[PDB]
């Protein structure tokens, strides 16, 4: 028992504002002492994404697909406002959207529950993991206003040169609005792969929601694919594990979700993902207890982070010079969740267990009362919380450290 390590490689992406300052402590205090895995490092501080024309970003994305596991701190996705603050060049796109794209596959959000920390939905006793397809659909579609009377028609035009296929969609007598969207069989099939794979690892059952009732052909295509794919390559594997796949009309699924105790992976389409994920986020409690994880369709490759932002407001009090109480846990979990993936590919039970023992030690700490402002507010309530109801970011980490070292001995 000293420093244990493992000979694959983590790929660290460094990120900015408050999350950045926590990254730096997490590492020093809770991971580097007891683990020394070799690390290809990158630095996606917006500081540097302007200094490198958003090109450490794309370097780092492929950096992961090579090595198989990544940790990302949260980063600033530029608004137009953001440009004036730091620096000009292009008002850049979101690193998350870039890496997600380069790696293929799908992001899965996971709450982290404690017993003293209540939820808003009384029935939820277990984690509901939403996985979001994040491509096509309403998000890359053409929209338009209609001011004349006229027709809105659609044309499919064969590439080989066959019959344009034409559909009268509607004839406007006054004014209105109009829109078209696509999706591709490849992006869906990859969503499906990534999902089936994700539920299978974590030993949970799997729902996908559509509205094929209404959209017989478009939503059907999704249903029909997961149906196609489940029975080809996974059903047998599911039964062996003892889990399942089912499909639901979205309206069931949200009823089910609400009324069910939890413990499942929920495939959502791109818009159902944006919409539901905010509900869960608020509902489970603090966004500071949630981890995004990015899985590839081959299942063998991953990039995990927190599911919150950089915490700008807190960062401002860091600069003011003031004390702060940011939840480092999603971020700490980020590390453990990753490291645990690197452990299960290296056949490494020393590190694997340390990732369990740290996650257990964090939960047992919160459950014994030592927690942060945000979680104090989950138990008590925003207006009714006071200083000696929580710890600052520093004290939490040094509280979980000391608790950790004692449980490292007794074994």
Ligand X SMILES: NC(=O)c1ccc[n+]([C@@H]2O[C@H](COP(=O)([O-])OP(=O)(O)OC[C@H]3O[C@@H](n4cnc5c(N)ncnc54)[C@H](O)[C@@H]3O)[C@@H](O)[C@H]2O)c1
Chain positions contacting ligand X, by CB under 6 A: 74-77, 96, 286-288, 305-313, 326-327, 330, 374
- In the complex, the smallest distance separating the C-beta of residue 10 from a second copy, rounded to whole angstroms, is 32
Rounded to whole angstroms, the Cα distance separating 226 from 133 reads 13
Q: At closest approach, how far in Å is the CB of 262 from a second copy?
A: 13
CB of 76 to ligand X, least distance (A): 4
Does the annotation flag 97 for ligand binding? Answer: yes
Residue 272 CB, shortest distance to Ca ion, in Å, is: 11
- Residue 171 contact among Ca ion, a second copy, ligand X, none, beta carbon within 5 to 8 Å by kind: a second copy
Any known ligand binding at 93? no
Size (the chain), residues: 411
* 147 labeled part of a ligand binding site: no
CB closer to ligand X, 96 vs 355: 96
Do 106 and 198 touch, CB atoms closer than 8 A?
A: yes
Nearest alpha-carbon partner for 37 in 326, 300, 274, 354: 354
Distance between CA atoms of 383 and 332, rounded to whole angstroms? Answer: 28
Binding residues for Ca ion restricted to 238-277, rule: CB under 5 A: 251, 274
Instruction: Check whether 99 is labelled as a binding-site residue.
Output: yes
User: Counting Cβ atoms within 10 Å, is residue 79 exposed (0-12), middle (13-18) or buried (19+)?
Assistant: exposed
Task: Tell me the C-alpha distance between 122 and 128, whole Å.
Answer: 14
Q: Give the residue closest to ligand X by C-beta.
A: 309
- Smallest gap from residue 132 Cβ to ligand X (A): 13
Q: Is 353 in the site for Ca ion (CB under 5 A)?
A: no
Q: Is 278 annotated as a binding residue?
A: yes
Of 68 and 273, which CB lies nearer to a second copy in the complex structure? 273
Least Å distance, CB 277 to Ca ion, is 5
Run of H or E residues at 312? helix 312-320
Q: For residues 33 and 309, which CB has a smaller minimum distance to ligand X in the complex?
A: 309
- Based on CB atoms, which residue is closest to ligand X, 200 or 338? 338
CB 274 within 8 A of CB 40: no
- Residue 217, marked binder: no
C-alpha dist (Å) from residue 234 to 46, 59, 193, 267: 41, 33, 10, 16
The response to whether 326 counts as a known ligand-binding position is yes
Q: Say if residues 20 and 391 touch (Cβ distance below 8 Å).
A: no
Cβ at position 382, least distance to a second copy in Å = 9
387 annotated ligand-binding residue: no
List of long-range contacts for 62-67, beta carbons under 8 Å, 24+ apart: 62/102, 63/11, 64/11, 64/99, 64/103, 64/301, 64/303, 65/102, 65/103, 65/296, 65/301, 67/8, 67/9, 67/10, 67/11, 67/40
Q: Site residues for Ca ion, window 354-383 (CB under 5 A)?
A: none
With respect to a second copy, which residue has the nearer C-beta, 255 or 368? 255
Task: Check the CA dihedral 306-310-313-319 and report its sign.
Answer: positive
Contact 200, 237 (CB under 8 A): yes
Residue 205 interacts with which of a second copy, ligand X, Ca ion, none, CB < 5 to 8 Å by class: none
Cβ closest to ligand X, residue 257 vs residue 375? 375
Identify the three-state secondary structure at position 391. strand
What residues are designated binding site? 72, 75, 77, 82, 94-100, 109, 132, 211, 251, 259, 274, 278, 305, 308-311, 313-314, 326-327
What residues are designated binding site for Ca(2+)? 251, 274, 278
What residues are designated binding site for Mn(2+)? 251, 274
Binding site for Ca ion (CB under 5 A): 251, 274, 278
């Amino acid at each position: 028992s000293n420093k244990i390590s493992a000979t694959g490689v983590l790929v660290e992406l460094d990120g900015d504002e408050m999350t950045r300052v926590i990254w730096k402590k997490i590492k020093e205090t809770l991971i580097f002492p007891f683990v020394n895995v070799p690390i290809e490092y990158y630095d996606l501080s917006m500081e540097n994404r302007d200094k490198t024309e958003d090109r450490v970003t794309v370097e780092a994305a492929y950096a992961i697909k090579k090595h198989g596991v990544g940790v990302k701190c949260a980063t600033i996705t530029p608004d137009e406002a953001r440009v004036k603050e730091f620096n000009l060049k292009k008002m850049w796109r979101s690193p998350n959207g870039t890496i997600r794209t380069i790696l293929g596959g799908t992001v899965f959000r996971e709450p982290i529950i404690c017993s003293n920390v209540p939820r808003l939905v009384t029935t939820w006793k277990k984690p509901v993991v939403i996985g979001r397809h994040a491509f096509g659909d309403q998000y890359s579609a053409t929209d338009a206003v209609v001011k004349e009377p006229g027709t809105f028609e659609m044309r499919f035009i064969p590439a080989n040169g066959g019959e344009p296929k034409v559909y009268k969609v509607f004839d406007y007598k006054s004014g209105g609005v109009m829109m078209g969207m696509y999706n591709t069989d490849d992006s869906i099939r990859d969503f499906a792969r990534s999902c089936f794979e994700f539920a299978l690892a974590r030993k949970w059952p799997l729902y996908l929601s559509t509205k094929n009732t209404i959209l017989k052909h478009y939503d059907g295509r999704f249903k029909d694919i997961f149906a196609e794919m489940y029975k080809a390559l996974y059903e047998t594997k599911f039964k062996t594990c003892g889990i399942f796949y089912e499909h639901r009309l979205i309206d069931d699924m949200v009823a089910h979700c609400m009324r069910s105790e939890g413990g499942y992976v929920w495939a959502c389409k791109n818009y159902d993902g944006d919409v539901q994920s905010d509900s869960l986020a608020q509902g489970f409690g603090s966004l500071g207890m949630m981890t995004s994880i990015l899985m590839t369709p081959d299942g063998k490759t991953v990039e995990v982070e927190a599911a919150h932002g950089t915490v700008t407001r807190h960062y401002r009090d860091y600069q003011k010079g003031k004390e702060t109480s940011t939840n480092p846990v999603a971020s700490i979990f980020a590390w453990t969740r990753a490291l645990a993936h690197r452990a299960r590919v290296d056949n490494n039970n020393t590190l694997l267990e340390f990732t369990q023992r740290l996650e257990d030690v964090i939960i047992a700490t919160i459950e014994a009362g030592a927690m942060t402002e945000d979680l104090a507010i989950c138990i008590k309530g925003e207006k009714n919380v006071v200083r000696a109801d929580y710890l600052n970011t520093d004290e939490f980490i040094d509280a979980v450290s000391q608790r950790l070292k004692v449980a490292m001995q007794k074994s």
